Amino acid sequence: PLWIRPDAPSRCTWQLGRPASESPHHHTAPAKSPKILPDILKKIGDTPMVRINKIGKKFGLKCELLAKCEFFNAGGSVKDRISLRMIEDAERDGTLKPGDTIIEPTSGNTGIGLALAAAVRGYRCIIVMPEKMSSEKVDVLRALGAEIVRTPTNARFDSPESHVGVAWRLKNEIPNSHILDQYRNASNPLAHYDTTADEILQQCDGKLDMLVASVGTGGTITGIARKLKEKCPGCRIIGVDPEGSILAEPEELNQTEQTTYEVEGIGYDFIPTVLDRTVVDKWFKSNDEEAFTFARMLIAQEGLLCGGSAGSTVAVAVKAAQELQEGQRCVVILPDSVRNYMTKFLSDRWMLQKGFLKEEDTEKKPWWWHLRVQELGLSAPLTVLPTITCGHTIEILREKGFDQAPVVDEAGVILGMVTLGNMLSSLLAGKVQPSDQVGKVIYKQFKQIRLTDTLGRLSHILEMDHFALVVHEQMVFGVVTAIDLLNFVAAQERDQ
Amino acid sequence: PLWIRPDAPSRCTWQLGRPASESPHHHTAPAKSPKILPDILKKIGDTPMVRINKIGKKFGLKCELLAKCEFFNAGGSVKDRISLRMIEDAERDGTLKPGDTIIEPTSGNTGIGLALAAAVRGYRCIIVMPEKMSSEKVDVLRALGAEIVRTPTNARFDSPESHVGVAWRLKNEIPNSHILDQYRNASNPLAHYDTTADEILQQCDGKLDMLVASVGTGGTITGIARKLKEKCPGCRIIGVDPEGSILAEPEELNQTEQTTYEVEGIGYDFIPTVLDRTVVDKWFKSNDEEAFTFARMLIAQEGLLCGGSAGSTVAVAVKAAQELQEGQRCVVILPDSVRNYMTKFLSDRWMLQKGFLKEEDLTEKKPWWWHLRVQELGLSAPLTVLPTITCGHTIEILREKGFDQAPVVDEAGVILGMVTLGNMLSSLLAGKVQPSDQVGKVIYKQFKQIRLTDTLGRLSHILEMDHFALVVHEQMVFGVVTAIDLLNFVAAQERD
Ligand code: HEM
Ligand code: HEM
Ligand SMILES: *Cc1c(COP(=O)(O)O)cnc(C)c1O
Ligand SMILES: *Cc1c(COP(=O)(O)O)cnc(C)c1O
C-alpha cells in the first residue's frame, strides 16, 4: 500500500524557546552571489522589499506598509525557493540521482520552479495540477520540457483522482521516480526559515510589527513565523485563507456554502503536515472579488505586477493592519506575478463574465463613453477599385482633396485602405512604382462599425486597431481613427 | 508645422578619445539601493549576468558565454531603464510638470515602462504602438491605466499613419502634453551609458572580448558601445538587425524581398538619431525562425524566460563568437520576458501556423508511441449510470460490479460527466453529501471526447488539458482513459 497522507500530523518536536542548536535539520544560510551566476537558479532569492504608498493611505492605514515582492524570482513565484531547496536537499541525501524522474502535485508555481530546475539540471519533470489552474502555466511548463497531467478540481484529496493521488500512482508506475512532496517535505518551510525570514529581518533591520501571508501549503508562513517568533517575537502573524478552505481558525470561520473559488495557489481541503497553525496569531478569510479587485488595484496604483494571491493578501492587510499606529510597519507577502494570470483577472471580459464586475461600475468612464458614432458627424469617403494603380491613386486623392481611400471591390468586399502620405512615401522611397498594384501599399487590417455604435466600443477597437469603418449589413459610411475621436472630444472641451 | 524627424542626423559632438569631462549632458552614476525601496521604480537596474551553459557548447563556441538578463526589471524589459531616466531628466529640466500628459510611440516595452512610471507618479499615459505587437502588451498596458492607440504596421515613418506621426498629432491635439521621444532623446543612450555598461564592466571586472546586442532604437548598443570603447576598448561590438530592416551595414546586407517580420522590438525603416552606427564593429542579419528557435531553445535549455528579441541576439552570438578561443568571453543582451509573447512563439500551434515549424521535425522529436491508435490500448467498456441515481446506490453498484469509475449518461444519451468510487466515498465520509442525495453534487463535469482512430499523441495533449478522455462513437462510450492508463500501456511495452 503506497500513498502518504499530506494531512498527517507533524512529528516535529520544535517548540517555541528551543535553542536553535537542537535542530536535526540541515540548515544552509543565505550567502553572497558571485558577479557572474553559473546558472539562472542562483537568481532565486534576495527579493526586494517595497513600500506601498497609495493603497495603504487609501484605506486609512496610519502605518508603514511594506511588500516583499517574490515575483522577481527566476520562475516568478515564491515556489522557486522551495523547489530549489527541496531538490538540493534531495541531492545531499543521495535520494535523488541525476537522470531521475521527478513527479510533483502543485498549484503550478512549484511545478514551474521544479520544471525550471529540471530543465537546467537534466532531471525529467512530470507535473500534476488541477484543471482549474490557468493555461499560461501550462504554456510555460510545456516550454520547459515538462510532461503535464491534470486532475479534477472537484476531487477530494482522499480520492484517487486528486493531484496527490494521481501523483503517487504515477510514482508507482514510473521506475526511479521521486516525489519531493512539498506538503510533507521539511525543505519547504525550512527554505522559508533560513532565507526569506532573514531577508525580511535584515530589510527591516529587525524591527517589525505585523506580517500578512496567504497560506497554501503553510510553508511560507510557517518558516517565516517561526524564525520571527524567535528573532522578533513581538510580531503578529496573520494568515489568509480563501473561503471554501478549511485551513483557518477557529473553525467557525470555515462555515460556508461554496466549495470552490477562482484564486489559484491558496487554500486546501486538508491540513498539510508542513503547516504549523499554532504560530498564526489570527486568521482572515478572503474571497475572489476582494482578491482580484485588490490585485488590479495593486497593479494600477502601485505598479506591482503580481498575482491574485497577492491581491488576497493585501486585501486582508488593509483590514488587519487597522489597529496599528504610525511609526509601526506591516509586511505583506506577494507570492507571484501576472504572467500566469494574463487571460484571467487581467482580462476585463473574464472579470465581467465571472461576476466580479458590475457593468454599472459605466461609472468610471468619461462623459463621452456613451454616445453614438453618429454624433461625430464624420464624412463620406471615396472608394477605389483594387485594380487601380499607385500613381492614379495619388492623382485621384489629390484632385479630389482626400487623404485616404478605402479599397473596395465590384463584388463589394472591402479589401483595405490606402493613404496619400504612405503612397507618396513608398513611391518617393522607390518601394513602389506608379504602375504598381495597390495591393503592396494597402493597409489590410481594420474593423467595422455601425452609426448606432457607442464611442466607447470605438475606444476599445482603437486599442486594438487603427481604422474603424462605419458600415451596414456592404457599404462604408465613414472612416475613423483615434485622432478623429480626439478632435471631437477636444472640440467639446472648448464648447463648455 | 510640428513634427520632428526621428531619423534626423545626430548633432552630438562626441568622438572617440574625448575626455568625459567635456560632456554637457547631466550624468547620474549608479548607487546602492536602500533596504526598503520607496517605490517599485527603484527596482529598475542591477540586472544579473548569467553564464549560458548548454547552448554555447552545443554550437561549438570555445568561449564563456554570458547573458545580461534585463527582464528582471520591474516592467520586465530593458526599456524600463530608459523609461525612468527619460522621466527623471525631464523632471530636472522642469519640462515635465506633475499632472501632465505623456505621449509615446513604442514597440511597447518603452510604453510599459512609461505607463508604469506614470501609474506610480500620477502622470497620464498615452501609448501609440503598431498593430503587429502582441496583445499581452496591450493587456498589461490597459491594466496599468494607459490609454492605447494603434497604428498600421506597414505604415512608413514618413507617413501620417506611423506611430511617430500619430504620436505627434496627438501631441498637437492635447494641451500640456509632451513626447519624450526615445528616438531623439539623449536620456535613452545615456541611460545605457551610465548604468548598464558600468554594470557589465563591474560584473566582468572590466575584462571582455565580444558583445552582442540587437538594435531597435540603438540606445542600448550605443550607450554600451561608447562606454565600452572608452573603458574596455578591445571589445568587439556586434549589432543584430532583423531581415527587412535597413539598420545594418554595409547596405548590401539589407537587400531583401520581404518588408515585414514577426520579431517585436527590433529593426526599423529609418535610422534613429540616438543610434551611432559608427561604434558597431559588425552587423548581423537575423530572421524570425532563427529567433524563435533560439528563444525556445533558450527557455528549454537554459531556463531563461525571455523574449524573441533575445532569441535573435543569441542566434547571432553562436555565429559571431566562433572566432573566439577559450579564455575569452562574449556578453549577450537579453531584452524582455515571455510575458509579452505568451500566446505567440511559446504556443506550438502559432509556430506551426506561421511556418516556423515543420510537422516532420515534431514527429521526429516524439517518442515511439506518439503515432498509435487509442484502439491499441485495448481498453474496456465502462458502466454508465443515470443522473437521478443517488450516491449510496452509486457506491453499491460500483462495488457490487467491481468498477472504480462510472460515466454518467442520459436517457437522451448526453454524457454529463464522471463519478468515481473514491470521491463518492470521500465525499460521504467527510459529510459533504448524504447517501440519499443526487449524484450531481459529487459529479466530475470536465472531460474530453476521443475516437478509437485518434492518435496517442493527441491523447497526450488532451491529457495535458484534461483528466478524463472518453473514447466514443457517433450514445456509446468505448472506454475511459487517463494519464495512468496510457502509462500502464507504455510501461508494459517498456517491460517487454
Ligand atoms: C530545535 C528545532 C527543531 C527540532 C529539534 C526538530 C526536530 C524534528 C524531529 C525530531 C522531526 C521528526 C524527524 C522524522 O521523523 O523524520 C522533525 C520533523 C520535521 N520538522 Fe523539525 N525540528 C526543529 C525545527 C523545525 C523548524 C524550524 C521547521 C520548519 C521551519 C521544521 C519543520 C519540520 C518538518 C516539516 C518536519 C517533518 C514532519 C514530518 O515528517 O512528519 N522543524 N523535526
Ligand atoms: C564628451 C562627450 C559629449 C559631448 C561633448 C557631447 C555634446 C553634445 C552636444 C553639443 C549635443 C547637441 C545638443 C543639442 O543641440 O540639443 C549633443 C546631443 C546629443 N548627445 Fe552628446 N555629447 C557627449 C557624449 C554623449 C554620449 C556619451 C552620448 C550617448 C552615448 C550622447 C548622446 C547624445 C544625444 C542623443 C544627443 C542628441 C542628439 C541631437 O539632439 O541631435 N552624447 N551632445
Ligand atoms: C503556493 C502559493 C501560495 C502559498 O504559499 P504557501 O507557502 O504554500 O503558504 C500563494 N500564492 C501562490 C501563487 C502560490 O503558488
Ligand atoms: C527596444 C527593444 C530592443 C532593442 O533595444 P534598443 O535599445 O532600442 O536597441 C530589443 N528587444 C526588445 C523586446 C525591445 O523592446
Short mmCIF file of C-alpha atoms in Angstrom, two decimals, chain A residues 99-403:
data_model
loop_
_atom_site.label_atom_id
_atom_site.label_comp_id
_atom_site.label_asym_id
_atom_site.label_seq_id
_atom_site.Cartn_x
_atom_site.Cartn_y
_atom_site.Cartn_z
CA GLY A 99 18.72 11.27 -14.67
CA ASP A 100 15.88 10.54 -12.28
CA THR A 101 12.27 11.49 -12.82
CA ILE A 102 10.60 13.99 -10.53
CA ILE A 103 6.85 13.99 -10.06
CA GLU A 104 5.02 16.75 -8.27
CA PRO A 105 1.45 17.75 -7.46
CA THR A 106 1.10 21.53 -7.50
CA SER A 107 -0.96 24.67 -7.91
CA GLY A 108 1.57 25.03 -10.71
CA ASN A 109 4.06 27.50 -9.33
CA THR A 110 6.07 24.83 -7.55
CA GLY A 111 5.64 22.84 -10.71
CA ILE A 112 7.25 25.76 -12.53
CA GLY A 113 10.20 26.02 -10.16
CA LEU A 114 10.80 22.31 -10.37
CA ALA A 115 10.41 22.14 -14.14
CA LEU A 116 12.84 25.02 -14.44
CA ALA A 117 15.43 23.44 -12.18
CA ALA A 118 14.98 20.18 -14.08
CA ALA A 119 15.48 21.89 -17.42
CA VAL A 120 18.75 23.17 -16.05
CA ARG A 121 19.92 20.02 -14.27
CA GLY A 122 18.71 17.38 -16.70
CA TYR A 123 16.04 15.83 -14.49
CA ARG A 124 12.86 14.61 -16.12
CA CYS A 125 9.87 16.56 -14.85
CA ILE A 126 6.28 15.44 -14.52
CA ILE A 127 3.67 17.77 -13.13
CA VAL A 128 0.21 17.07 -11.79
CA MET A 129 -2.12 20.01 -11.38
CA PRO A 130 -5.88 20.56 -11.09
CA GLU A 131 -7.80 21.56 -14.20
CA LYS A 132 -8.74 24.90 -12.66
CA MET A 133 -5.31 26.40 -12.97
CA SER A 134 -4.51 28.84 -15.77
CA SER A 135 -3.34 27.83 -19.24
CA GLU A 136 -0.43 30.24 -19.09
CA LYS A 137 1.15 27.98 -16.50
CA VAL A 138 0.65 25.07 -18.85
CA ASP A 139 2.31 27.03 -21.63
CA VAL A 140 5.40 27.90 -19.61
CA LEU A 141 5.63 24.38 -18.19
CA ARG A 142 5.39 22.78 -21.58
CA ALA A 143 8.05 25.17 -22.85
CA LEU A 144 10.32 23.97 -20.05
CA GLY A 145 10.07 20.40 -21.30
CA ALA A 146 7.78 19.17 -18.55
CA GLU A 147 5.16 16.48 -19.07
CA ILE A 148 1.77 17.57 -17.83
CA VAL A 149 -1.09 15.76 -16.12
CA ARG A 150 -4.31 17.28 -14.85
CA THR A 151 -6.77 16.35 -12.13
CA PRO A 152 -10.40 17.33 -11.50
CA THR A 153 -10.73 20.43 -9.39
CA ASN A 154 -13.68 18.82 -7.67
CA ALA A 155 -11.74 15.80 -6.42
CA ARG A 156 -11.17 15.39 -2.68
CA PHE A 157 -7.54 14.73 -1.74
CA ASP A 158 -8.55 11.34 -0.35
CA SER A 159 -9.80 10.24 -3.73
CA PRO A 160 -7.55 8.62 -6.29
CA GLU A 161 -8.27 11.42 -8.77
CA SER A 162 -6.83 14.26 -6.74
CA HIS A 163 -3.45 15.62 -7.78
CA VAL A 164 -1.71 13.99 -4.83
CA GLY A 165 -3.34 10.65 -5.59
CA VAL A 166 -2.56 10.75 -9.28
CA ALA A 167 0.99 11.80 -8.46
CA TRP A 168 1.51 8.86 -6.15
CA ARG A 169 0.02 6.39 -8.61
CA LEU A 170 2.28 7.65 -11.39
CA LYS A 171 5.16 7.31 -8.93
CA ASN A 172 4.13 3.70 -8.56
CA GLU A 173 4.14 3.25 -12.32
CA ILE A 174 7.47 5.01 -13.01
CA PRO A 175 10.88 3.41 -12.23
CA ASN A 176 13.42 5.54 -10.33
CA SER A 177 10.97 8.38 -9.83
CA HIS A 178 10.65 10.57 -6.77
CA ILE A 179 8.03 12.79 -5.23
CA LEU A 180 9.54 15.65 -3.28
CA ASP A 181 6.16 16.26 -1.63
CA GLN A 182 6.01 19.96 -0.72
CA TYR A 183 3.25 19.17 1.74
CA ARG A 184 5.35 16.82 3.86
CA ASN A 185 8.86 17.98 2.99
CA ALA A 186 10.87 19.81 5.62
CA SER A 187 12.81 21.55 2.91
CA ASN A 188 9.92 23.88 2.02
CA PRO A 189 9.22 25.60 5.36
CA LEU A 190 12.90 25.25 6.14
CA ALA A 191 13.71 27.13 2.97
CA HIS A 192 11.39 29.83 4.16
CA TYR A 193 13.01 29.69 7.61
CA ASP A 194 16.64 30.04 6.57
CA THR A 195 16.30 32.62 3.82
CA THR A 196 13.04 34.56 3.42
CA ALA A 197 12.76 35.41 7.10
CA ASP A 198 16.40 36.50 7.27
CA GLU A 199 15.80 38.72 4.25
CA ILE A 200 12.77 40.35 5.83
CA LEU A 201 14.57 40.89 9.13
CA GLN A 202 17.65 42.33 7.51
CA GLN A 203 15.48 44.54 5.33
CA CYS A 204 13.52 45.73 8.36
CA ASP A 205 16.70 46.00 10.47
CA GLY A 206 14.94 43.51 12.73
CA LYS A 207 12.11 45.86 13.70
CA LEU A 208 8.70 44.60 12.61
CA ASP A 209 5.13 44.80 13.91
CA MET A 210 2.69 42.82 11.75
CA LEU A 211 3.15 40.24 8.98
CA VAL A 212 0.47 39.17 6.49
CA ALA A 213 0.65 35.97 4.44
CA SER A 214 -1.80 33.90 2.44
CA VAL A 215 -1.35 30.21 3.06
CA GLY A 216 -1.43 27.45 0.50
CA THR A 217 0.92 24.87 2.00
CA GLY A 218 1.79 26.91 5.05
CA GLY A 219 5.50 26.65 4.27
CA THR A 220 5.96 30.37 3.85
CA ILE A 221 4.02 31.41 6.92
CA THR A 222 5.45 28.51 8.87
CA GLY A 223 9.14 29.15 8.34
CA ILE A 224 8.67 32.89 8.48
CA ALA A 225 6.56 32.89 11.63
CA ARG A 226 8.90 30.51 13.43
CA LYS A 227 12.06 32.48 12.71
CA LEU A 228 10.09 35.61 13.58
CA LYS A 229 8.82 34.32 16.92
CA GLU A 230 12.45 33.63 17.62
CA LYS A 231 14.14 36.83 16.41
CA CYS A 232 11.31 39.39 16.53
CA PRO A 233 8.74 37.79 18.88
CA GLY A 234 6.66 40.97 19.05
CA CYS A 235 5.43 40.43 15.51
CA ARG A 236 1.83 39.37 14.93
CA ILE A 237 1.38 36.73 12.25
CA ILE A 238 -1.73 36.96 10.09
CA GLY A 239 -2.84 34.08 7.93
CA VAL A 240 -5.07 34.47 4.90
CA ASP A 241 -7.34 31.70 3.72
CA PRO A 242 -9.83 31.68 0.85
CA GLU A 243 -13.45 30.94 1.69
CA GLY A 244 -14.04 27.27 0.90
CA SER A 245 -10.80 26.27 2.55
CA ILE A 246 -10.75 24.61 5.96
CA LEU A 247 -7.34 25.95 6.97
CA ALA A 248 -8.25 28.89 9.21
CA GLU A 249 -9.13 29.03 12.91
CA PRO A 250 -11.47 28.95 14.69
CA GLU A 251 -13.46 26.50 12.56
CA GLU A 252 -16.43 28.88 12.80
CA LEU A 253 -14.72 30.85 10.03
CA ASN A 254 -14.82 27.96 7.60
CA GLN A 255 -18.56 27.59 7.60
CA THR A 256 -19.55 28.34 4.03
CA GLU A 257 -21.65 27.14 1.13
CA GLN A 258 -19.47 27.18 -1.97
CA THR A 259 -16.70 24.60 -2.11
CA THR A 260 -14.70 26.28 -4.90
CA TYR A 261 -13.05 29.61 -5.64
CA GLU A 262 -11.18 31.23 -8.52
CA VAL A 263 -7.92 32.32 -6.84
CA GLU A 264 -5.09 29.93 -7.62
CA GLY A 265 -2.40 28.75 -5.25
CA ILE A 266 -4.03 29.24 -1.86
CA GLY A 267 -6.37 27.17 0.26
CA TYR A 268 -6.90 23.44 0.57
CA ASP A 269 -9.41 20.87 1.77
CA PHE A 270 -6.85 19.40 4.16
CA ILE A 271 -4.19 20.46 6.64
CA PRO A 272 -0.68 19.98 5.20
CA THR A 273 1.89 18.46 7.54
CA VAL A 274 4.31 21.32 6.92
CA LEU A 275 1.73 23.73 8.22
CA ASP A 276 2.07 24.74 11.85
CA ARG A 277 -1.14 26.58 12.70
CA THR A 278 -0.12 27.27 16.28
CA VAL A 279 2.24 30.03 15.16
CA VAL A 280 -0.53 32.02 13.48
CA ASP A 281 -1.83 34.82 15.70
CA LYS A 282 -5.01 35.32 13.70
CA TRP A 283 -6.67 34.13 10.52
CA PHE A 284 -8.60 36.13 7.97
CA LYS A 285 -10.94 34.89 5.28
CA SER A 286 -10.71 36.31 1.79
CA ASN A 287 -12.90 35.88 -1.28
CA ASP A 288 -12.25 36.12 -5.00
CA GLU A 289 -13.79 39.56 -5.52
CA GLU A 290 -11.58 41.04 -2.81
CA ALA A 291 -8.53 39.37 -4.28
CA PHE A 292 -8.90 40.41 -7.88
CA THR A 293 -10.08 43.91 -7.04
CA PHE A 294 -7.01 44.44 -4.90
CA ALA A 295 -4.63 42.84 -7.37
CA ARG A 296 -5.87 45.04 -10.19
CA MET A 297 -5.72 47.94 -7.76
CA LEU A 298 -2.18 46.91 -6.88
CA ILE A 299 -1.03 46.95 -10.48
CA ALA A 300 -2.79 50.17 -11.42
CA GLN A 301 -1.88 52.19 -8.34
CA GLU A 302 1.42 50.69 -7.19
CA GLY A 303 2.78 49.31 -10.46
CA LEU A 304 3.39 45.91 -8.90
CA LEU A 305 2.68 43.26 -11.47
CA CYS A 306 1.56 40.42 -9.30
CA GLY A 307 -0.84 37.53 -8.90
CA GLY A 308 -4.26 37.36 -7.30
CA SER A 309 -2.78 35.59 -4.31
CA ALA A 310 -1.05 38.86 -3.54
CA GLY A 311 -4.42 40.52 -4.07
CA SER A 312 -5.97 38.40 -1.33
CA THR A 313 -3.04 39.09 0.93
CA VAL A 314 -3.18 42.86 0.68
CA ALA A 315 -6.96 42.73 0.79
CA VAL A 316 -6.57 41.23 4.24
CA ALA A 317 -3.72 43.55 5.15
CA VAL A 318 -5.79 46.73 4.81
CA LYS A 319 -8.17 45.34 7.43
CA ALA A 320 -5.89 43.55 9.86
CA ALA A 321 -3.41 46.43 9.97
CA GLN A 322 -6.04 48.94 11.09
CA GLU A 323 -5.12 48.52 14.74
CA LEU A 324 -1.54 49.65 14.13
CA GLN A 325 -0.45 53.23 14.62
CA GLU A 326 2.04 55.45 12.80
CA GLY A 327 5.69 54.66 13.42
CA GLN A 328 4.92 50.97 13.02
CA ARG A 329 5.07 48.74 9.98
CA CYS A 330 3.26 45.84 8.34
CA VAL A 331 4.94 43.48 5.89
CA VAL A 332 2.90 41.69 3.23
CA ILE A 333 3.94 38.69 1.14
CA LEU A 334 3.27 38.87 -2.61
CA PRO A 335 3.63 35.31 -3.99
CA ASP A 336 3.68 35.60 -7.81
CA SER A 337 3.30 37.65 -11.00
CA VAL A 338 0.63 38.36 -13.58
CA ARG A 339 2.38 36.11 -16.07
CA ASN A 340 0.24 33.13 -15.05
CA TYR A 341 -2.95 35.11 -14.94
CA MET A 342 -2.72 37.02 -18.23
CA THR A 343 -6.04 35.84 -19.62
CA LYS A 344 -7.98 35.68 -16.41
CA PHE A 345 -8.26 38.52 -13.94
CA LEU A 346 -6.32 40.87 -16.13
CA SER A 347 -8.94 40.48 -18.85
CA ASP A 348 -11.93 42.70 -18.13
CA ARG A 349 -14.30 40.42 -20.01
CA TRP A 350 -13.35 37.49 -17.79
CA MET A 351 -13.92 39.62 -14.71
CA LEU A 352 -17.30 40.56 -16.09
CA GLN A 353 -18.05 37.01 -17.15
CA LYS A 354 -17.30 35.70 -13.66
CA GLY A 355 -19.38 38.37 -11.95
CA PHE A 356 -16.54 40.29 -10.32
CA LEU A 357 -17.53 43.43 -12.18
CA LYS A 358 -20.88 45.13 -12.36
CA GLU A 359 -21.25 46.96 -15.67
CA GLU A 360 -22.74 49.83 -13.68
CA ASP A 361 -19.37 50.42 -12.03
CA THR A 362 -20.06 52.87 -16.68
CA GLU A 363 -19.45 54.96 -13.58
CA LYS A 364 -15.69 55.06 -14.09
CA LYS A 365 -15.97 56.06 -17.74
CA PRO A 366 -15.65 59.64 -19.11
CA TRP A 367 -18.72 61.58 -20.26
CA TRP A 368 -18.46 60.70 -23.95
CA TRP A 369 -18.33 56.98 -23.24
CA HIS A 370 -21.95 56.50 -24.13
CA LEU A 371 -22.60 58.42 -27.29
CA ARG A 372 -23.27 57.29 -30.83
CA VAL A 373 -20.69 57.43 -33.60
CA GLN A 374 -23.29 59.48 -35.44
CA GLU A 375 -22.53 62.39 -33.11
CA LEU A 376 -19.06 62.76 -34.68
CA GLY A 377 -20.77 63.78 -37.89
CA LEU A 378 -17.99 62.22 -39.93
CA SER A 379 -17.99 62.47 -43.70
CA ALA A 380 -18.39 60.11 -46.63
CA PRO A 381 -15.08 58.86 -48.07
CA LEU A 382 -14.04 57.97 -51.59
CA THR A 383 -13.65 54.36 -52.64
CA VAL A 384 -11.38 52.84 -55.27
CA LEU A 385 -11.00 49.54 -57.12
CA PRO A 386 -8.15 47.19 -56.16
CA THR A 387 -7.02 47.01 -59.78
CA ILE A 388 -6.19 50.70 -59.67
CA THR A 389 -2.56 51.77 -59.75
CA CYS A 390 -0.49 53.73 -57.27
CA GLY A 391 0.00 56.77 -59.46
CA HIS A 392 -3.66 57.01 -60.38
CA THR A 393 -4.40 56.72 -56.69
CA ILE A 394 -2.24 59.72 -55.86
CA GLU A 395 -3.77 61.63 -58.75
CA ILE A 396 -7.33 60.97 -57.64
CA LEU A 397 -6.72 61.56 -53.96
CA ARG A 398 -5.03 64.89 -54.59
CA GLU A 399 -7.51 66.01 -57.24
CA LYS A 400 -10.50 65.27 -55.02
CA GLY A 401 -8.67 66.52 -51.94
CA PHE A 402 -8.77 63.34 -49.88
CA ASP A 403 -6.01 61.84 -47.78
#
